[PDB]
Enzyme design. Structure first.
Site, PDB file in Angstrom:
ATOM      1  N   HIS A 185       0.830  -1.220   0.000  1.00  7.91           N
ATOM      2  CA  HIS A 185       0.000   0.000   0.000  1.00  7.91           C
ATOM      3  C   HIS A 185       0.855   1.257   0.000  1.00  7.91           C
ATOM      4  CE1 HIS A 185      -3.115  -2.893   1.425  1.00  7.91           C
ATOM      5  NE2 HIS A 185      -3.895  -2.144   0.666  1.00  7.91           N
TER       6      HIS A 185
ATOM      7  N   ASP B 278      -4.924   5.892  -0.276  1.00  6.94           N
ATOM      8  CA  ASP B 278      -4.149   5.063   0.671  1.00  6.94           C
ATOM      9  C   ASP B 278      -3.092   5.879   1.419  1.00  6.94           C
ATOM     10  OD1 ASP B 278      -5.290   2.493   0.746  1.00  6.94           O
ATOM     11  OD2 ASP B 278      -4.224   1.723  -0.940  1.00  6.94           O
TER      12      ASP B 278
ATOM     13  N   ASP C 260      -8.863  -0.429  -7.227  1.00  3.66           N
ATOM     14  CA  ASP C 260      -8.067  -0.814  -6.082  1.00  3.66           C
ATOM     15  C   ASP C 260      -7.566  -2.267  -6.165  1.00  3.66           C
ATOM     16  OD1 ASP C 260      -6.815  -0.150  -3.724  1.00  3.66           O
ATOM     17  OD2 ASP C 260      -8.465  -0.601  -2.407  1.00  3.66           O
TER      18      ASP C 260
ATOM     19  N   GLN D 125      -6.248 -17.639  -2.943  1.00  4.05           N
ATOM     20  CA  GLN D 125      -6.459 -16.887  -4.183  1.00  4.05           C
ATOM     21  C   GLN D 125      -7.742 -17.320  -4.905  1.00  4.05           C
ATOM     22  OE1 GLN D 125      -4.628 -14.148  -5.556  1.00  4.05           O
ATOM     23  NE2 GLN D 125      -3.992 -14.080  -3.383  1.00  4.05           N
TER      24      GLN D 125
HETATM   25  C1  LIG Z   1      -5.186 -10.590  -4.718  1.00  3.12           C
HETATM   26  O1  LIG Z   1      -5.183 -11.204  -3.421  1.00  3.12           O
HETATM   27  C2  LIG Z   1      -5.918 -10.535  -2.489  1.00  3.12           C
HETATM   28  C3  LIG Z   1      -6.128  -9.156  -2.527  1.00  3.12           C
HETATM   29  C4  LIG Z   1      -6.883  -8.544  -1.498  1.00  3.12           C
HETATM   30  N1  LIG Z   1      -7.121  -7.220  -1.493  1.00  3.12           N
HETATM   31  C5  LIG Z   1      -7.827  -6.652  -0.541  1.00  3.12           C
HETATM   32  N2  LIG Z   1      -8.345  -7.327   0.480  1.00  3.12           N
HETATM   33  C6  LIG Z   1      -8.215  -8.651   0.585  1.00  3.12           C
HETATM   34  N3  LIG Z   1      -8.811  -9.354   1.630  1.00  3.12           N
HETATM   35  C7  LIG Z   1      -9.496  -8.476   2.611  1.00  3.12           C
HETATM   36  C8  LIG Z   1     -10.239  -9.293   3.698  1.00  3.12           C
HETATM   37  C9  LIG Z   1     -11.174 -10.370   3.104  1.00  3.12           C
HETATM   38  C10 LIG Z   1     -10.444 -11.158   1.983  1.00  3.12           C
HETATM   39  C11 LIG Z   1     -11.289 -12.225   1.296  1.00  3.12           C
HETATM   40  C12 LIG Z   1     -12.669 -12.067   1.116  1.00  3.12           C
HETATM   41  C13 LIG Z   1     -13.417 -13.069   0.502  1.00  3.12           C
HETATM   42  C14 LIG Z   1     -12.795 -14.221   0.049  1.00  3.12           C
HETATM   43  C15 LIG Z   1     -11.426 -14.386   0.226  1.00  3.12           C
HETATM   44  C16 LIG Z   1     -10.677 -13.393   0.841  1.00  3.12           C
HETATM   45  C17 LIG Z   1      -9.891 -10.138   0.988  1.00  3.12           C
HETATM   46  C18 LIG Z   1      -7.436  -9.314  -0.433  1.00  3.12           C
HETATM   47  C19 LIG Z   1      -7.177 -10.703  -0.425  1.00  3.12           C
HETATM   48  C20 LIG Z   1      -6.435 -11.292  -1.420  1.00  3.12           C
HETATM   49  O2  LIG Z   1      -6.203 -12.646  -1.440  1.00  3.12           O
HETATM   50  C21 LIG Z   1      -6.000 -13.211  -0.148  1.00  3.12           C
HETATM   51  C22 LIG Z   1      -6.576 -14.609  -0.349  1.00  3.12           C
HETATM   52  C23 LIG Z   1      -6.348 -15.630   0.741  1.00  3.12           C
HETATM   53  C24 LIG Z   1      -7.426 -16.040   1.519  1.00  3.12           C
HETATM   54  C25 LIG Z   1      -7.243 -16.995   2.488  1.00  3.12           C
HETATM   55  C26 LIG Z   1      -5.943 -17.528   2.673  1.00  3.12           C
HETATM   56  C27 LIG Z   1      -5.659 -18.509   3.653  1.00  3.12           C
HETATM   57  C28 LIG Z   1      -4.374 -18.978   3.771  1.00  3.12           C
HETATM   58  C29 LIG Z   1      -3.349 -18.506   2.935  1.00  3.12           C
HETATM   59  C30 LIG Z   1      -3.584 -17.551   1.995  1.00  3.12           C
HETATM   60  C31 LIG Z   1      -4.888 -17.048   1.842  1.00  3.12           C
HETATM   61  N4  LIG Z   1      -5.155 -16.139   0.903  1.00  3.12           N
HETATM   62 MG   LIG Z   2      -6.732   0.943   1.013  1.00  5.01          MG
HETATM   63 ZN   LIG Z   3      -5.468   0.852  -2.389  1.00  6.93          ZN
END
Ligand SMILES: COc1cc2ncnc(N3CCC[C@@H](c4ccccc4)C3)c2cc1OCCc1ccc2ccccc2n1
Ligand SMILES: [Mg+2]
Ligand SMILES: [Zn+2]
EC number: 3.1.4.17
Length: 305
Positions: free
Chosen positions: A63, A102, A212, A264
């Site tokens: 960020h 940000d 974003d 992912q």
């Molecule tokens: C481009 O990548 C991501 C970009 C993101 N950008 C912004 N916020 C995120 N989070 C915020 C909280 C909620 C989360 C979310 C919501 C719904 C479904 C899934 C995730 C998203 C992001 C998560 C991402 O990816 C993170 C994904 C993830 C989720 C669980 C995991 C569990 C173990 C290891 C890695 C993990 N990685």
């Molecule tokens: Mg932000």
């Molecule tokens: Zn941002």
């Protein structure tokens, strides 16, 4: 001036702004003058504003200042391919919102701030850091020689600041789920009305989300490398959660890093694909974002196989 390759590539949704920081201001100036006219923004004031915004981004993994300009570029490409939909004023506001959204980000989520009992969470209960980013934006605008909006009427100034506030707040991904659900229902019932200010603010909100999250719409080598910076912050926040005596969610727990591909997949399914799908339904020329998102989903599926 802009190199020939950048001049061409900047129009692509999947453009990457490159590793030369001193080129980014010129990239932003070019985008805002191409979108909103060389009229408005005295170059000197804009450049001064840009340099102060940069100074108030932090050297965090994701960020950071590069992210700000990258999000601004995505907005540029949406606006360039949807001519005649948004006013000059909206276009300026959206591009400035993207640059500023940000400001002063420390690499931690609103949730961590809440758990920490950080003073910002007492000031702003919901969308904590986003309310802060907006406040920092106003503070920068108020610095001597920094009012890039000085030639606007009082009414237009108030108008543009409101556009920026709503746009920055909309980058709180917690707000995206409900925003998208409502837009989707309006699409399907055929009741979406871009001349209705409340609907219009919603569409801008989704645009802000789409910009974003744009790492998932780049070409795979860019998407994959960017994911490294994203996890670098998440894992650092997870370490800090452990230090508060709270077990972090898996996504923030470096011990679960082998589950990145599955995580992912979850993200693309629940967030990225629906976001760009809804965006394309409302603004068909944004289709390349959705296509690239789908391509990246396939690559993540390939990693798992
Ligand atoms: C481009 O990548 C991501 C970009 C993101 N950008 C912004 N916020 C995120 N989070 C915020 C909280 C909620 C989360 C979310 C919501 C719904 C479904 C899934 C995730 C998203 C992001 C998560 C991402 O990816 C993170 C994904 C993830 C989720 C669980 C995991 C569990 C173990 C290891 C890695 C993990 N990685
Ligand atoms: Mg932000
Ligand atoms: Zn941002």
């Amino acid at each position: 001036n802009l190199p020939a390759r950048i001049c061409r590539d900047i129009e692509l949704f999947h453009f990457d702004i490159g590793p030369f920081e001193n080129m980014w201001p010129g990239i932003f100036v070019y985008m805002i003058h191409r979108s909103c006219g060389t009229s408005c923004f005295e170059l000197e004031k804009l450049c001064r504003f840009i340099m102060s915004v940069k100074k108030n981004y932090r050297r965090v993994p994701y960020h950071n200042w590069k992210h700000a300009v990258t999000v601004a570029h995505c907005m540029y490409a949406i606006l360039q391919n949807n001519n005649g939909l948004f006013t000059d004023l909206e276009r300026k506001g959206l591009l400035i919102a993207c640059l500023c959204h940000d400001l002063d980000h420390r690499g931690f989520s609103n949730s961590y701030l809440q758990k920490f009992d950080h003073p910002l969470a007492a000031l702003y209960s919901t969308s904590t850091m986003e309310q802060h980013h907006f406040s920092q934006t106003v503070s920068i605008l108020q610095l001597e020689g920094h009012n890039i909006f000085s030639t606007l009427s009082s009414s237009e100034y108030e108008q543009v600041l409101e556009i920026i506030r709503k746009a920055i707040i909309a980058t709180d991904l917690a707000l995206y789920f409900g925003n998208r659900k409502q837009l989707e229902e309006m699409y399907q019932t055929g009741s979406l009305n871009l001349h209705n200010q409340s609907h219009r603010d919603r569409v801008i909100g989704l645009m802000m989300t789409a910009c974003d999250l744009c790492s998932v719409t780049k070409l795979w080598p860019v998407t994959k490398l960017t994911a490294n910076d994203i996890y670098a912050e998440f894992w650092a926040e997870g370490d800090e959660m452990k230090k508060l005596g709270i077990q972090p969610i898996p996504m923030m727990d470096r011990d679960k890093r082998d589950e990145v591909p599955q995580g992912q997949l979850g993200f693309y399914n629940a967030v990225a694909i629906p976001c760009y799908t809804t965006l394309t339904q409302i603004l068909p020329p944004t289709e390349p974002l959705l296509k690239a998102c789908r391509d990246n989903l396939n690559q993540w599926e390939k990693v798992i196989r």
